[PDB]
PDB file of all heavy atoms in Angstrom:
ATOM      1  N   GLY A   1      -5.544   6.434   2.847  1.00 50.16           N
ATOM      2  CA  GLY A   1      -6.205   5.144   2.818  1.00 50.16           C
ATOM      3  C   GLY A   1      -5.359   3.917   3.019  1.00 50.16           C
ATOM      4  O   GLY A   1      -4.100   3.998   2.761  1.00 50.16           O
ATOM      5  N   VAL A   2      -5.900   2.927   3.575  1.00 51.95           N
ATOM      6  CA  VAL A   2      -5.063   1.656   3.784  1.00 51.95           C
ATOM      7  C   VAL A   2      -5.947   0.471   3.534  1.00 51.95           C
ATOM      8  O   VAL A   2      -7.135   0.486   3.813  1.00 51.95           O
ATOM      9  CB  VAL A   2      -4.376   1.572   5.096  1.00 51.95           C
ATOM     10  CG1 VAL A   2      -5.553   1.599   6.174  1.00 51.95           C
ATOM     11  CG2 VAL A   2      -3.600   0.318   5.229  1.00 51.95           C
ATOM     12  N   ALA A   3      -5.502  -0.536   2.924  1.00 50.64           N
ATOM     13  CA  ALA A   3      -6.168  -1.820   2.749  1.00 50.64           C
ATOM     14  C   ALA A   3      -5.183  -2.956   2.893  1.00 50.64           C
ATOM     15  O   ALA A   3      -3.961  -2.800   2.695  1.00 50.64           O
ATOM     16  CB  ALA A   3      -6.726  -1.861   1.345  1.00 50.64           C
ATOM     17  N   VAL A   4      -5.755  -4.110   3.231  1.00 46.60           N
ATOM     18  CA  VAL A   4      -4.891  -5.303   3.433  1.00 46.60           C
ATOM     19  C   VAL A   4      -5.581  -6.575   2.784  1.00 46.60           C
ATOM     20  O   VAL A   4      -6.756  -6.840   3.030  1.00 46.60           O
ATOM     21  CB  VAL A   4      -4.592  -5.579   4.959  1.00 46.60           C
ATOM     22  CG1 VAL A   4      -5.938  -5.766   5.659  1.00 46.60           C
ATOM     23  CG2 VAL A   4      -3.733  -6.811   5.079  1.00 46.60           C
ATOM     24  N   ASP A   5      -4.804  -7.347   1.918  1.00 45.57           N
ATOM     25  CA  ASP A   5      -5.397  -8.476   1.302  1.00 45.57           C
ATOM     26  C   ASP A   5      -5.206  -9.757   2.019  1.00 45.57           C
ATOM     27  O   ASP A   5      -4.559  -9.672   3.127  1.00 45.57           O
ATOM     28  CB  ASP A   5      -4.906  -8.668  -0.191  1.00 45.57           C
ATOM     29  CG  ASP A   5      -3.408  -8.853  -0.331  1.00 45.57           C
ATOM     30  OD1 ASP A   5      -2.780  -9.237   0.796  1.00 45.57           O
ATOM     31  OD2 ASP A   5      -2.910  -8.632  -1.390  1.00 45.57           O
ATOM     32  N   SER A   6      -5.760 -10.769   1.550  1.00 43.99           N
ATOM     33  CA  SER A   6      -5.762 -12.116   2.267  1.00 43.99           C
ATOM     34  C   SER A   6      -4.310 -12.668   2.550  1.00 43.99           C
ATOM     35  O   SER A   6      -4.136 -13.386   3.556  1.00 43.99           O
ATOM     36  CB  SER A   6      -6.463 -13.190   1.456  1.00 43.99           C
ATOM     37  OG  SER A   6      -5.941 -13.306   0.172  1.00 43.99           O
ATOM     38  N   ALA A   7      -3.328 -12.246   1.735  1.00 42.79           N
ATOM     39  CA  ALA A   7      -1.961 -12.592   2.054  1.00 42.79           C
ATOM     40  C   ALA A   7      -1.341 -11.619   3.139  1.00 42.79           C
ATOM     41  O   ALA A   7      -0.266 -12.052   3.598  1.00 42.79           O
ATOM     42  CB  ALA A   7      -1.140 -12.482   0.790  1.00 42.79           C
ATOM     43  N   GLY A   8      -1.918 -10.553   3.430  1.00 44.90           N
ATOM     44  CA  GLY A   8      -1.361  -9.629   4.361  1.00 44.90           C
ATOM     45  C   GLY A   8      -0.543  -8.565   3.732  1.00 44.90           C
ATOM     46  O   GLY A   8       0.254  -7.834   4.404  1.00 44.90           O
ATOM     47  N   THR A   9      -0.556  -8.399   2.328  1.00 45.63           N
ATOM     48  CA  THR A   9       0.076  -7.309   1.674  1.00 45.63           C
ATOM     49  C   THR A   9      -0.698  -6.003   2.043  1.00 45.63           C
ATOM     50  O   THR A   9      -1.903  -6.092   2.144  1.00 45.63           O
ATOM     51  CB  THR A   9      -0.031  -7.528   0.157  1.00 45.63           C
ATOM     52  OG1 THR A   9       0.802  -8.648  -0.174  1.00 45.63           O
ATOM     53  CG2 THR A   9       0.472  -6.293  -0.577  1.00 45.63           C
ATOM     54  N   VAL A  10      -0.037  -4.938   2.258  1.00 48.88           N
ATOM     55  CA  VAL A  10      -0.619  -3.718   2.658  1.00 48.88           C
ATOM     56  C   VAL A  10      -0.571  -2.699   1.643  1.00 48.88           C
ATOM     57  O   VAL A  10       0.492  -2.462   1.010  1.00 48.88           O
ATOM     58  CB  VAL A  10      -0.040  -3.210   4.070  1.00 48.88           C
ATOM     59  CG1 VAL A  10      -0.739  -1.928   4.566  1.00 48.88           C
ATOM     60  CG2 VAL A  10      -0.142  -4.344   5.114  1.00 48.88           C
ATOM     61  N   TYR A  11      -1.752  -2.016   1.316  1.00 46.90           N
ATOM     62  CA  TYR A  11      -1.811  -1.125   0.288  1.00 46.90           C
ATOM     63  C   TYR A  11      -2.119   0.335   0.917  1.00 46.90           C
ATOM     64  O   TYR A  11      -3.048   0.514   1.684  1.00 46.90           O
ATOM     65  CB  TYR A  11      -2.880  -1.358  -0.702  1.00 46.90           C
ATOM     66  CG  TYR A  11      -2.751  -2.746  -1.279  1.00 46.90           C
ATOM     67  CD1 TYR A  11      -3.308  -3.780  -0.749  1.00 46.90           C
ATOM     68  CD2 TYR A  11      -1.931  -2.927  -2.458  1.00 46.90           C
ATOM     69  CE1 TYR A  11      -3.187  -5.132  -1.326  1.00 46.90           C
ATOM     70  CE2 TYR A  11      -1.788  -4.255  -3.017  1.00 46.90           C
ATOM     71  CZ  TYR A  11      -2.446  -5.330  -2.397  1.00 46.90           C
ATOM     72  OH  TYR A  11      -2.261  -6.573  -2.969  1.00 46.90           O
ATOM     73  N   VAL A  12      -1.325   1.383   0.521  1.00 48.56           N
ATOM     74  CA  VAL A  12      -1.573   2.743   1.143  1.00 48.56           C
ATOM     75  C   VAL A  12      -1.642   3.778   0.027  1.00 48.56           C
ATOM     76  O   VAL A  12      -0.832   3.755  -0.898  1.00 48.56           O
ATOM     77  CB  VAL A  12      -0.349   3.005   2.037  1.00 48.56           C
ATOM     78  CG1 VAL A  12      -0.574   4.405   2.574  1.00 48.56           C
ATOM     79  CG2 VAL A  12      -0.313   1.972   3.212  1.00 48.56           C
ATOM     80  N   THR A  13      -2.642   4.508   0.089  1.00 48.60           N
ATOM     81  CA  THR A  13      -2.657   5.713  -0.728  1.00 48.60           C
ATOM     82  C   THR A  13      -1.814   6.848  -0.113  1.00 48.60           C
ATOM     83  O   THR A  13      -2.067   7.375   0.991  1.00 48.60           O
ATOM     84  CB  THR A  13      -4.015   6.338  -0.956  1.00 48.60           C
ATOM     85  OG1 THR A  13      -4.786   6.507   0.294  1.00 48.60           O
ATOM     86  CG2 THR A  13      -4.810   5.385  -1.804  1.00 48.60           C
ATOM     87  N   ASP A  14      -0.688   7.051  -0.833  1.00 47.52           N
ATOM     88  CA  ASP A  14       0.321   7.970  -0.424  1.00 47.52           C
ATOM     89  C   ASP A  14      -0.087   9.404  -1.066  1.00 47.52           C
ATOM     90  O   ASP A  14       0.396   9.829  -2.114  1.00 47.52           O
ATOM     91  CB  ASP A  14       1.706   7.522  -0.893  1.00 47.52           C
ATOM     92  CG  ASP A  14       2.883   8.448  -0.338  1.00 47.52           C
ATOM     93  OD1 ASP A  14       2.546   9.234   0.514  1.00 47.52           O
ATOM     94  OD2 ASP A  14       4.036   8.239  -0.844  1.00 47.52           O
ATOM     95  N   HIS A  15      -1.084   9.981  -0.392  1.00 49.96           N
ATOM     96  CA  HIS A  15      -1.788  11.202  -0.914  1.00 49.96           C
ATOM     97  C   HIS A  15      -0.847  12.311  -1.290  1.00 49.96           C
ATOM     98  O   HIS A  15      -0.993  12.944  -2.451  1.00 49.96           O
ATOM     99  CB  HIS A  15      -2.761  11.603   0.257  1.00 49.96           C
ATOM    100  CG  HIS A  15      -3.436  12.978  -0.119  1.00 49.96           C
ATOM    101  ND1 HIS A  15      -2.918  14.218   0.345  1.00 49.96           N
ATOM    102  CD2 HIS A  15      -4.619  13.203  -0.677  1.00 49.96           C
ATOM    103  CE1 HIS A  15      -3.769  15.154  -0.102  1.00 49.96           C
ATOM    104  NE2 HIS A  15      -4.856  14.576  -0.739  1.00 49.96           N
ATOM    105  N   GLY A  16       0.094  12.647  -0.495  1.00 50.27           N
ATOM    106  CA  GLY A  16       1.110  13.675  -0.826  1.00 50.27           C
ATOM    107  C   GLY A  16       2.017  13.424  -1.982  1.00 50.27           C
ATOM    108  O   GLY A  16       2.700  14.245  -2.502  1.00 50.27           O
ATOM    109  N   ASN A  17       2.027  12.132  -2.495  1.00 53.29           N
ATOM    110  CA  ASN A  17       2.909  11.771  -3.538  1.00 53.29           C
ATOM    111  C   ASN A  17       2.216  11.270  -4.870  1.00 53.29           C
ATOM    112  O   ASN A  17       2.749  10.646  -5.703  1.00 53.29           O
ATOM    113  CB  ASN A  17       3.900  10.699  -3.162  1.00 53.29           C
ATOM    114  CG  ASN A  17       4.890  11.243  -2.279  1.00 53.29           C
ATOM    115  OD1 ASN A  17       5.488  12.317  -2.452  1.00 53.29           O
ATOM    116  ND2 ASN A  17       5.296  10.460  -1.177  1.00 53.29           N
ATOM    117  N   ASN A  18       0.829  11.348  -4.800  1.00 55.04           N
ATOM    118  CA  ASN A  18      -0.105  11.000  -5.879  1.00 55.04           C
ATOM    119  C   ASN A  18       0.179   9.578  -6.351  1.00 55.04           C
ATOM    120  O   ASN A  18       0.110   9.248  -7.522  1.00 55.04           O
ATOM    121  CB  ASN A  18      -0.042  11.884  -7.077  1.00 55.04           C
ATOM    122  CG  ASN A  18      -0.684  13.193  -6.829  1.00 55.04           C
ATOM    123  OD1 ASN A  18      -1.528  13.339  -5.954  1.00 55.04           O
ATOM    124  ND2 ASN A  18      -0.369  14.319  -7.591  1.00 55.04           N
ATOM    125  N   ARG A  19       0.414   8.623  -5.375  1.00 53.79           N
ATOM    126  CA  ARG A  19       0.661   7.277  -5.712  1.00 53.79           C
ATOM    127  C   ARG A  19      -0.045   6.302  -4.708  1.00 53.79           C
ATOM    128  O   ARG A  19      -0.436   6.800  -3.691  1.00 53.79           O
ATOM    129  CB  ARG A  19       2.177   7.100  -5.731  1.00 53.79           C
ATOM    130  CG  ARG A  19       2.787   7.117  -4.348  1.00 53.79           C
ATOM    131  CD  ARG A  19       4.331   7.183  -4.382  1.00 53.79           C
ATOM    132  NE  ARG A  19       4.829   6.957  -2.996  1.00 53.79           N
ATOM    133  CZ  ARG A  19       6.100   6.866  -2.610  1.00 53.79           C
ATOM    134  NH1 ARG A  19       7.027   6.897  -3.538  1.00 53.79           N
ATOM    135  NH2 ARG A  19       6.426   6.647  -1.357  1.00 53.79           N
ATOM    136  N   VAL A  20      -0.029   5.050  -5.040  1.00 51.81           N
ATOM    137  CA  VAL A  20      -0.521   4.030  -4.151  1.00 51.81           C
ATOM    138  C   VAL A  20       0.617   3.079  -3.956  1.00 51.81           C
ATOM    139  O   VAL A  20       1.191   2.558  -5.054  1.00 51.81           O
ATOM    140  CB  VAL A  20      -1.756   3.376  -4.817  1.00 51.81           C
ATOM    141  CG1 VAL A  20      -2.255   2.287  -3.877  1.00 51.81           C
ATOM    142  CG2 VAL A  20      -2.847   4.380  -5.162  1.00 51.81           C
ATOM    143  N   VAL A  21       0.908   2.784  -2.793  1.00 48.98           N
ATOM    144  CA  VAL A  21       2.053   1.938  -2.590  1.00 48.98           C
ATOM    145  C   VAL A  21       1.672   0.580  -1.970  1.00 48.98           C
ATOM    146  O   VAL A  21       0.703   0.483  -1.246  1.00 48.98           O
ATOM    147  CB  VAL A  21       3.134   2.572  -1.702  1.00 48.98           C
ATOM    148  CG1 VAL A  21       3.781   3.745  -2.482  1.00 48.98           C
ATOM    149  CG2 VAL A  21       2.527   3.080  -0.437  1.00 48.98           C
ATOM    150  N   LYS A  22       2.406  -0.346  -2.223  1.00 52.53           N
ATOM    151  CA  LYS A  22       2.220  -1.770  -1.841  1.00 52.53           C
ATOM    152  C   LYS A  22       3.422  -2.223  -1.073  1.00 52.53           C
ATOM    153  O   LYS A  22       4.617  -2.041  -1.442  1.00 52.53           O
ATOM    154  CB  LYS A  22       2.053  -2.642  -3.146  1.00 52.53           C
ATOM    155  CG  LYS A  22       2.137  -4.055  -3.077  1.00 52.53           C
ATOM    156  CD  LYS A  22       1.622  -4.723  -4.258  1.00 52.53           C
ATOM    157  CE  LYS A  22       2.322  -6.073  -4.602  1.00 52.53           C
ATOM    158  NZ  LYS A  22       1.341  -7.043  -5.159  1.00 52.53           N
ATOM    159  N   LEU A  23       3.229  -2.910   0.001  1.00 52.88           N
ATOM    160  CA  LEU A  23       4.196  -3.525   0.906  1.00 52.88           C
ATOM    161  C   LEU A  23       4.017  -5.002   0.919  1.00 52.88           C
ATOM    162  O   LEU A  23       3.066  -5.429   1.555  1.00 52.88           O
ATOM    163  CB  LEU A  23       4.300  -2.987   2.322  1.00 52.88           C
ATOM    164  CG  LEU A  23       5.407  -3.441   3.222  1.00 52.88           C
ATOM    165  CD1 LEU A  23       6.783  -2.921   2.816  1.00 52.88           C
ATOM    166  CD2 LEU A  23       5.109  -3.152   4.647  1.00 52.88           C
ATOM    167  N   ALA A  24       4.872  -5.721   0.263  1.00 52.85           N
ATOM    168  CA  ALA A  24       4.743  -7.174   0.116  1.00 52.85           C
ATOM    169  C   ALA A  24       5.115  -7.812   1.412  1.00 52.85           C
ATOM    170  O   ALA A  24       6.094  -7.549   2.018  1.00 52.85           O
ATOM    171  CB  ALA A  24       5.654  -7.609  -0.967  1.00 52.85           C
ATOM    172  N   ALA A  25       4.200  -8.733   1.858  1.00 52.88           N
ATOM    173  CA  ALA A  25       4.537  -9.514   3.027  1.00 52.88           C
ATOM    174  C   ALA A  25       5.766 -10.243   3.031  1.00 52.88           C
ATOM    175  O   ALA A  25       6.217 -10.765   1.983  1.00 52.88           O
ATOM    176  CB  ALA A  25       3.282 -10.392   3.372  1.00 52.88           C
ATOM    177  N   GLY A  26       6.586 -10.136   4.102  1.00 55.96           N
ATOM    178  CA  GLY A  26       7.795 -10.977   4.230  1.00 55.96           C
ATOM    179  C   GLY A  26       9.029 -10.365   3.845  1.00 55.96           C
ATOM    180  O   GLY A  26      10.025 -10.130   4.540  1.00 55.96           O
ATOM    181  N   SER A  27       9.090  -9.976   2.465  1.00 55.67           N
ATOM    182  CA  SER A  27      10.416  -9.494   1.974  1.00 55.67           C
ATOM    183  C   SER A  27      10.293  -7.903   2.186  1.00 55.67           C
ATOM    184  O   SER A  27      11.381  -7.226   2.009  1.00 55.67           O
ATOM    185  CB  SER A  27      10.395  -9.678   0.340  1.00 55.67           C
ATOM    186  OG  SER A  27       9.251  -9.118  -0.173  1.00 55.67           O
TER     187      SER A  27
END
C-alpha cells in the first residue's frame, strides 16, 4: 500500500516487515 498526505509525506505498508513506514518530505 501507499498513501500521500497534503504535505507530500509518503506512507507505505512494508508488508514483509509487518510495519508501516513514513517518509517525511524534505529531510
Side-chain angles (χ1 to χ4, degrees):
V2 60
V4 58
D5 64 19
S6 58
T9 293
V10 183
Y11 307 90
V12 176
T13 50
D14 188 10
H15 176 269
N17 289 319
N18 289 336
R19 68 189 191 175
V20 181
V21 292
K22 164 166 151 146
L23 181 73
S27 58

